[PDB]
Amino acid sequence: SSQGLLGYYFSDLNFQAPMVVTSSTTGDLSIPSSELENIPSENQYFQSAIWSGFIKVKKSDEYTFATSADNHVTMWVDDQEVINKASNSNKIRLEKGRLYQIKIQYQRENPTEKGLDFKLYWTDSQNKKEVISSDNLQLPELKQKSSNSRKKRSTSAGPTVPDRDNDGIPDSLEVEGYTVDVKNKRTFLSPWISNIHEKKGLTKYKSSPEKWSTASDPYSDFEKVTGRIDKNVSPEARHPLVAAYPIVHVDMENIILSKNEDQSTQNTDSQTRTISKNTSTSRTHTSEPGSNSNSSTVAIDHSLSLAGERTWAETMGLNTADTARLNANIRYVNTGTAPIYNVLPTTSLVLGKNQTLATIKAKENQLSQILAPNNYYPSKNLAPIALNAQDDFSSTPITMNYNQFLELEKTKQLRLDTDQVYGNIATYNFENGRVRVDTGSNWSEVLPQIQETTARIIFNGKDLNLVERRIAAVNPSDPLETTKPDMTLKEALKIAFGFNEPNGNLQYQGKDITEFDFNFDQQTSQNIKNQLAELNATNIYTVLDKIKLNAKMNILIRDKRFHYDRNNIAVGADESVVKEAHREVINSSTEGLLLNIDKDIRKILSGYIVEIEDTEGLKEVINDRYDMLNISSLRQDGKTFIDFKKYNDKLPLYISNPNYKVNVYAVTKENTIINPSENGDTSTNGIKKILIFSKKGYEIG
Ligand SMILES: [Ca+2]
Ligand SMILES: [Ca+2]
């Protein structure tokens, strides 16, 4: 179906203006004029063509080859001419289960019909003639190396379409620009033509004629654009300028802490004394100069989970000589553009700066599913992985000594550092036209080259989570990399992240590019500054189509509404933004508030404080504890309810005088208190909070 001979159809007589490149499943190599909608009528006249591939016979015999235009054809089988501008009955012996190279050239001056009607036949020893069937034809070996049975180069006899990197796309098309259009059953690759293709919304591709994969990834420029590729590769990475590669971090969903048994305590029948908390995990990115790493940071919930206000040690019965253990539920997350099949990366679980508590490994070659881009392992419809699994005798306890435990209690943070060891790659095989995991292909042989030859953009426009993409970009000092097309900042955002420009303004899902800020590493910053100066431009947002990306740039693009920590996690927002986000109140009562709040805003709030203010200006704080601020919840209808009763002994607010005010304040993550004060105070005293609702009793109804 994606198999057969590869054909190049030229408008000129001498094989130099390719109009269509496409495959044929059978010996019918025709292109009817009805299929040439994307070619100018005048270029629909084909004066030459070349086909290449292999023939595999099902039975040894003597065959004679013929075409529908023998006077215009020369054909080679494994370097030997079988047709030479004349019909013949010259038989050739072909052996079953052997592969023979095929090259066919056709030339005809001034055709009177558009397209091409052309069939390749053979006749066996019994004198039966037919168009060669699909089971007998295979594509050329369009790879960087030959296989044992299939040479990557066609015979030096006759014409060679210039294809320096052997990906299948002619040099000239890669440089000048090409488009791909899907006929009913075939993909046609043709030159870009402004006045035809622009209006139709077709993508203009350019790629390096000297790089088999312009992004230095494991899929060729041709494989990508013709769909001869792992179906799990992300849509954006089907562009030859966007790198296809996995990017993995670990998400921790919840944690349970408990005291380790010890030989001195023979008693094992005591009551449960564990601490269980939800956790929130974010993939991070830091200013570390040379970084190319995977890491995530875990925030352990500090909100009320059990009676009293005990220390963790008191809760768990931990004395100073005891040790504690952690278990957790996790998933792997692939935010990259290619899947993983047989090796999950190894992860260190780290306390503080550099105290490793655990090394998390999965068994190689025993994955229960693929880890696909924009997805999880295990999938979300399945249970997560427990670090110490119930079925597993050999899971290492994740232990902390007393001092480490106290440090975890104080910081309520862990870090997960994940390596970039991703295993084998599923590649396309031209012999059988299928994608399979290839034992000879490994991500570790690809990643360094991807990292060296691309510009990196990290963007948080999807739910404020950091998503990295890499785009092929020129390196002015590496000659091979100068053969790549110019990559602009505007184009990179379109092809890598799906920005569009419906009305003269670049947008991501309705939000203008000006709603996002640009952050650069030191070298990228100097580069971009220099470019702006050379453009006489004072504002980057008006010249995104003129800013050129270079290999090894690092660009970070973040939603401007938010405040960010050093990990580039969103942790707050300006008071004006938070106030406006809460302005639309659906209902209010002594039981709480019902509001429509934007999902991104909700992400940066740790909770709310409710207070009644009397006429003299004194305030009664209702939920007056740092661990009692979790009073918001998202309803199924998408609305947020702020629950006044939850920490008011299950009672609606009592407003003794209608002139009293009910005030509700939002507390952002960056302002959240996560421990009692040094003096032991557990109240909300001093917490930096943002007034988001204030109404008198008679206004609440
Ligand atoms: Ca090529
Ligand atoms: Ca190429």
Description:
The chain is mainly β and 701 residues long. The protein folds into four domains: 1-244, Toxin - Anthrax Protective Antigen,domain 1 (Toxin - Anthrax Protective Antigen, domain 1, Alpha-Beta Complex), CATH 3.90.182.10; 245-451, Sandwich (Jelly Rolls), CATH 2.60.120; 452-570, Ubiquitin-like (UB roll) (Roll), CATH 3.10.20.110; 571-701, Sandwich (Immunoglobulin-like), CATH 2.60.40. 11% of the residues lie in helices and 33% in strands. Bound molecules: calcium ion (2 copies). Residues 165, 167, 169, 174, 207-209, 211-212, 214, 221 line the site of one calcium ion.
Based on secondary structure, the structural category is mainly beta
What is the CATH architecture descriptor of the largest domain? Alpha-Beta Complex
Distance between the termini: 69 Å
Report on the biggest sheet: 10 strands, antiparallel
Q: Given the structure, what is the number of helices?
A: 11
The share of residues in helices is: 10-25%
Rounded Rg: 33 Å
CATH fold-level topology of the largest domain: Toxin - Anthrax Protective Antigen, domain 1
Bound molecules: calcium ion
Q: Report the principal-axis shape.
A: elongated
PDB class: protein transport, toxin
Keywords: protein transport, toxin
Assembly: monomeric
Entry title: Crystal Structure of Anthrax Protective Antigen (Membrane Insertion Loop Deleted) to 1.45-A resolution
